[PDB]
């Protein structure tokens, strides 16, 4: 079973690399993180930072969620992220993605005790 915090780590965290390792990164990671099992998830973002830096975002700038409610928070610093977006010829079960490297502020929704990131809302 996965708690919401554990699913956020599976869907959005990859501190094992400092940036997407090559143009094939989303094609491999979308499958290995199990995001393409039942359908091709069309967009997903991965965060290449320590989890401790991402959990601290929960006490930073409060903003409304784009979806949720207003329990979203935007990071003060920019972070190393990868955007994975399904390409035109992708079709389940052969999901294919374009990998884009970016350095942007992240916005996450946080919940619980301890109060941690449970959803990736957006990047700006």
C-beta atoms surrounding 66 within 10 Å: 10
Continuous segment of H or E residues that includes residue 25: helix 25-32
Structure resolution, Å? 1.9
Q: For residue 18, give both structure tokens.
A: 């400092």
For residue 61, give the nearest of 49, 70, 69, 53 by alpha carbon: 70
- Are 64 and 72 spatial neighbours (Cβ–Cβ below 8 Å)? yes
How many domains does the chain contain in total?
Answer: 1
d(CA 42, CA 91): 10
Q: For residue 74, give both structure tokens.
A: 């935007």
Does 45 belong to an annotated binding site? yes
Contacts of 91 (CB under 8 A, 6+ apart): 40
- Are 108 and 79 spatial neighbours (Cβ–Cβ below 8 Å)? no
Which residues form the domain of 66? Answer: 1-124
Does 33 belong to an annotated binding site? no
- Are 77 and 56 spatial neighbours (Cβ–Cβ below 8 Å)? no
Experimental method: X-ray
**CATH number of the CATH domain containing 87:** 3.10.130.10
Does 118 belong to an annotated binding site? no
For residue 43, give the nearest of 101, 109, 99 by alpha carbon: 99
Q: Which residues are catalytic?
A: 12, 119
């Amino acid at each position: 079973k996965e708690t919401a915090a554990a699913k956020f780590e599976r869907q959005h965290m990859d501190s094992s690399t400092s940036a997407a390792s090559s143009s094939n990164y989303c094609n491999q990671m979308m499958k290995s993180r199990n995001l393409t099992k039942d359908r091709c998830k069309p967009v997903n973002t991965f965060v290449h930072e320590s989890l401790a830096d991402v959990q601290a975002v929960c006490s930073q700038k409060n903003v409304a969620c784009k979806x949720g409610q207003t329990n979203c928070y935007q990071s003060y610093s920019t972070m190393s992220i990868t955007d994975c977006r399904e390409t035109g010829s992708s079709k389940y079960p052969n999901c294919a993605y374009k990998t884009t490297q970016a350095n942007k502020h992240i916005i996450v929704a946080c919940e619980g005790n301890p109060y941690v990131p449970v959803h990736f809302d957006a990047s700006v």
